[PDB]
Design a protein around this ligand. Structure first.
Ligand SMILES: C[N+]1(C)[C@@H]2C[C@@H](OC(=O)[C@H](CO)c3ccccc3)C[C@H]1[C@@H]1O[C@@H]12
Length: 384
């Protein structure tokens, strides 16, 4: 039987690799926020707590579950079984309410801009996170650990490990409705209002200009510099014809409006000098002109102030990773209410693992797309 043994060795290697990636990625996120004040924002406070729950899953949950499935029974004991189940459900519930905190916090940012942002401090974020973990502990830990003493009998036999009050399939489905399906519905509606709020024009032009300027600086070939030059110039002219939030609400004849347009005119002049040199065969010189563009952009930036499009995308990525990795297990619970043989044990294990995988892919949804996280990662990994 060489194939069965190879399956066991393959599973141990894959599970150990998944656990290790989950641990390293989330420790990198947590340490980066703690050592970089530029990363110490309210958003990253929520992401810090989310990385903390993901780290616990990678350290405790994945390894204990791998030991459970590989050995074929629970080898540690009833106490360690109860602690593992309680830790798993408390951490998972804290994750769900953490995503609800991120979704509601973003909702009040886009719907109450005159009131909520001033109430959005680090102390408020810490209290919300602390309340989420305490509520999760109170909801799940006493029932999981002490239900056997409430009914006066432990029905979990030796070598088994499962939540005792989940012996009724309808109870498990009710848990799936209250703890997974309703929160997912709330976050979906909340995100729906988020993307509808983001769906004003001035930020959409200035963000395009800065983005294409970065693309010019870090371009690999001659096509990227051309496309970014043209699209930045189009966004530059659209941002030129419009009026910024100028002070004193001055007329177009004002010295503030005239010099505002003049800065964009000089910007287009350097843009066309860069485009010319790019067509002469001096594509490297067009990149040097982008630095001069950056200089001119910094010489007349006092007239302007939005990365919030990236923030909305980041939230959607975190929400989709949660929904997609946790939905299979929860539909197995739904089918389990009326057909237990319809879900084999191997399928249950896969659904359980996909939920764990949520913690593995979580850091890649926000950390691997943020310039400050990337630079802090590089600093943490470079030899001093
Ligand atoms: C560790 N898990 C893989 C176990 C199985 C799943 O359980 C759920 O999806 C239920 C809702 O059906 C759930 C329980 C608690 C908190 C959130 C969801 C995901 C998490 C949770 O701790 C359990």
């Amino acid at each position: 039987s060489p194939y069965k043994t190879f399956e066991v060795v393959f599973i141990v290697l894959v599970a150990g690799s998944l656990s290790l990636v989950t641990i390293i990625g989330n420790i990198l996120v947590m340490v980066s926020i703690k050592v970089n004040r530029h990363l110490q924002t309210v958003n990253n406070y929520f992401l810090f707590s989310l990385a903390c729950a993901d780290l616990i899953i990678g350290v405790f949950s994945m390894n204990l579950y791998t030991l459970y499935t590989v050995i074929g029974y629970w080898p540690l004991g009833p106490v360690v079984c109860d602690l593992w189940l309680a830790l798993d459900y408390v951490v998972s519930n804290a994750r769900v309410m953490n995503l609800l905190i991120i979704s509601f916090d973003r909702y009040f940012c886009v719907t109450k801009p005159l009131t909520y942002p001033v109430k959005r401090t680090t102390k408020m974020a810490g209290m919300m996170i602390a309340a989420a973990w305490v509520l999760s502990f109170i909801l799940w830990a006493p029932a999981i650990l002490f239900w056997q003493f409430i009914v006066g009998v432990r029905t979990v036999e030796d070598g088994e490990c499962y939540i005792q009050f989940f012996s009724n399939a309808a109870v498990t489905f009710g848990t799936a409705i209250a703890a997974f399906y309703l929160p997912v519905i709330i976050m979906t509606v909340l995100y729906w209002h988020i993307s509808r709020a983001s769906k004003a024009d001035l930020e959409d032009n200035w963000e395009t200009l800065n983005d294409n300027l970065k693309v010019i600086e870090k371009a690999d070939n001659a096509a990227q510099v051309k496309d970014a030059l043209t699209k930045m110039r189009a966004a530059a002219l659209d941002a030129q014809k419009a009026t910024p939030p100028k002070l004193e609400d001055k007329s177009p004849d004002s010295p503030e409006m005239k010099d505002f347009r003049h800065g964009f005119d000089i910007l287009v002049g350097q843009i066309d000098d860069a485009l010319k040199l790019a067509n002469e065969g001096k594509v490297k010189e067009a990149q040097a002109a982008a630095e001069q563009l950056k200089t001119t952009r910094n010489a007349y930036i006092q007239k302007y102030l939005s990365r919030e499009k990236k923030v909305t995308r980041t939230i959607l990525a975190i929400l989709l990773a949660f929904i997609i990795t946790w939905a299979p297990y929860n539909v197995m619970v739904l089918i389990n209410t009326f057909c237990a043989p319809c879900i084999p044990n191997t399928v249950w294990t896969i659904g359980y693992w996909l939920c764990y995988i949520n913690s593995t892919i979580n850091p890649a949804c926000y950390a691997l797309c943020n310039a400050t996280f990337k630079k802090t990662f590089k600093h943490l990994l470079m030899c001093h």
